[PDB]
């Protein structure tokens, strides 16, 4: 088991480093978007394949942390590039969704409630961070709104996916508290950029009503 | 597998008939609540155990239908009895949840759209039907409201749980249309019932909210 996890971690690190170098190299154009999408998918699938074989907490915890760092680094690299707004949005949204998926896949095995809450809070924090960087770059209101929409829906899906498996109010409190904070962070940041006010009210309203449903649902756990 | 399904169906029929007779016999008090609560879990667990074993889609579909019929039959039996309001509500509410769970377990093994739609639409229909009878004889507003609220959430958990396994807009339409009908039926019956406006407002508000999130999330596929 330890050797298998070591192979997973080593190859993930190596492939991530090579992709980082390549992303640095290429000078311009939509080939950047193509490469970003390809690398995101490759690392996501490769990391997910390892989860099927682990059987212990630290191995799972390290696997999740490594993957989260890798995908963060890739999108961070694309941030430096000049790229079209729509391609940037699709890239970062596509990257985030893959982090959500692997986050959910790993959580399915963690029997220790404390670790389950910890791994949860981490991913909710991580996905929130990425959306902040994209919001610092989007060139148009419609692009920013669409990313904001996906931010609420994905974080909700990750939040509930945790609540199903949590079982004791120590986890229930923290997952509720973290979800509230993350929702506020996204909404507060998104409100700062230039966008049509009516669309902004809609986005903020949707953000507000999701936290209510989460809180209503968590209370019934 | 056919023989295993035969054993499952036969024993489910036997136990159902036996509890039907017993519930007919007894004539007083909280012993009725005890009997119903114990009986519901017994049939559910036996169904869940059988569902673990493989089957052809139709065999699975029959298994789900049989269980749904049984738990409805027991609930209908208790309806004829006098009971304390809280015990009656907790009985039929707690019974309904077990139909939800078995429906969730069954859907995990489906592999075709026809079964996914049929099983989904049926269970959302059935769970809605039971609440109709519970509300048909509720004693007081506060008890009626608390169970009426649960009617929204427990339909939602099944609705989205189906949504995430479906893969085609044709199936998506069935889930969307059924969810709208179920929400309206609950709202209409609760509106007809006698209850304070303050509670009736939140019940209507939750319906307005909860259909929208399904409308968004089921569309995002």
DSSP structure string for chain A? -HHHHHHHHHHHHHHHHHHHHHHHH--SSTHHHHHHHHHHHHHHHHHHHHHTT--SHHHHHHHHHHHHHHHHHHHHHHHHS---HHHHHHHHHHHHHHHHHHHHHHHTT---HHHHHHHHHHHHHHHHHHHHHHHTT--SHHHHHHHHHHHHHHHHHHHHHHHHH--SHHHHHHHHHHHHHHHHHHHHHHHHS---HHHHHHHHHHHHHHHHHHHHHHHT-
Burial bucket for residue A25 (CB in 10 Å: 0-12, 13-18, 19+):
exposed
Measured on CA atoms in the order B124, B127, B129, B134, is the torsion positive or negative? negative
Chain A, 142-161: which have a CB under 8 Å from a chain B CB? 153, 157
Q: Which structure tokens are listed for B209?
A: 């909210």
- Report the chain B residue with the minimal C-alpha distance to residue A207: B213
From CA A14, how far away is CA A21, in angstroms rounded? 11
Q: What share of chain B is helix, strand, coil (3-state, %, to 5)?
A: 85, 0, 15
Rounded to a whole number of angstroms, the distance from the CA of A162 to the nearest CA of chain B is: 14
> Which method was used?
cryo-EM
Element at B50 (helix H, strand E):
helix B31-51
Which among A92, A97, A90, A89 is positioned nearest to A76, based on CA atoms? Answer: A92
Q: Report the interhelical angle of A85-107 vs A31-51 (nearest 10°).
A: 0
**Taking a C-beta distance cutoff of 8 angstroms, is the pair A70, A12 a contact?**
yes
Chain A, 154 to 193: residues with Cβ < 8 Å from chain B are 157
Helix or strand (DSSP H, E) at B191: helix B169-192
Which one of B153, B210, B216 has the shortest CB-CB distance to A153?
Answer: B216
Judged on CB neighbours under 10 Å (0-12, 13-18, 19+), A134 is buried
**A210·B213 Cβ contact <8 A:** yes
Judge contact between B113 and B170, C-beta under 8 A.
yes
The verdict on a CB contact (< 8 Å) between B213 and A213 is yes
Which residues in chain A are contacts of B213 at CB distance < 8 A?
Answer: 209-210, 213
**B215–chain A Cβ distance below 8 A for any pair:** no
Q: CA-CA distance, B189 to B9, in Å (whole number)?
A: 34
What tokens appear for B194 in the block? 């006698």
Which residue is it, tokens 């409100």? A191
Contact A75, A130 (CB under 8 A): yes
Q: Which of B207, B210, B216 to mutate to test the interface with A (most CBs of A within 10 A)?
A: B216
Distance from CA of A101 to the nearest CA of B (A): 13
Contact A23, A35 (CB under 8 A): yes
Q: Does A217 touch chain B (CB under 8 A)?
A: yes
Show residues of chain A in contact with B220, CB under 8 Å: 153
Residue of A213, A217, A220 lying closest to B209 (CB–CB): A213
Q: Determine the Cα–Cα distance for residues B170 and B193; give it in Å rounded to an integer.
A: 36
Resolution of the experimentally solved model in angstroms: 4.1
Contacts of B152 in chain A (CB under 8 A): none
The whole-angstrom distance between A31's CA and the closest CA on chain B is: 26
Q: How far is CA A65 from the centre of its chain?
A: 12
Q: How far is it, in rounded angstroms, from Cα A47 to Cα A27?
A: 28
Residue B220 phi/psi, 5-degree rounding, is -80, 75
Q: How far apart are CA B21 and CA A122, in angstroms?
A: 54
E strand or H helix at B114, and its extent? Answer: helix B113-136
Residue B189: phi and psi, rounded to 5, are -65, -45
């Amino acid at each position: 088991p330890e050797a298998a996890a070591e192979l997973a971690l080593a190859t993930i690190e190596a492939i991530t480093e090579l992709f980082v170098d390549a992303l640095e190299i290429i000078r311009s154009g939509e080939v950047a978007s193509r490469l970003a999408k390809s690398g995101i998918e490759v690392i996501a699938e490769l990391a997910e394949a390892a989860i099927e074989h682990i059987d212990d907490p630290e191995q799972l915890k390290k696997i999740v942390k490594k993957a989260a760092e890798a995908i963060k680094k890739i999108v961070e690299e694309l941030i430096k590039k000049d790229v079209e707004d729509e391609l940037l949005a699709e890239v970062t949204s596509e990257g985030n969704r893959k982090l959500s998926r692997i986050t959910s896949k790993a959580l399915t095995k963690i029997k220790d409630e404390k670790a389950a809450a910890e791994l949860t809070i981490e991913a909710i924090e991580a996905i929130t961070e990425n959306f902040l960087l994209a919001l610092e770059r989007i060139k148009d209101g419609e692009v920013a709104a669409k990313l904001a929409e996906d931010g609420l829906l994905e974080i909700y899906r990750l939040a509930v996916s945790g609540i199903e498996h949590i079982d004791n109010p120590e986890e229930l409190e923290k997952i509720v508290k973290k979800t509230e904070e993350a929702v506020e962070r996204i909404v507060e940041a998104l409100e700062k950029k230039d966008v049509e006010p009516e669309l902004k009210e809609e986005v903020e309203e949707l953000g507000k009503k999701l936290v209510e449903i989460v809180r209503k649902l968590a209370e019934r756990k």
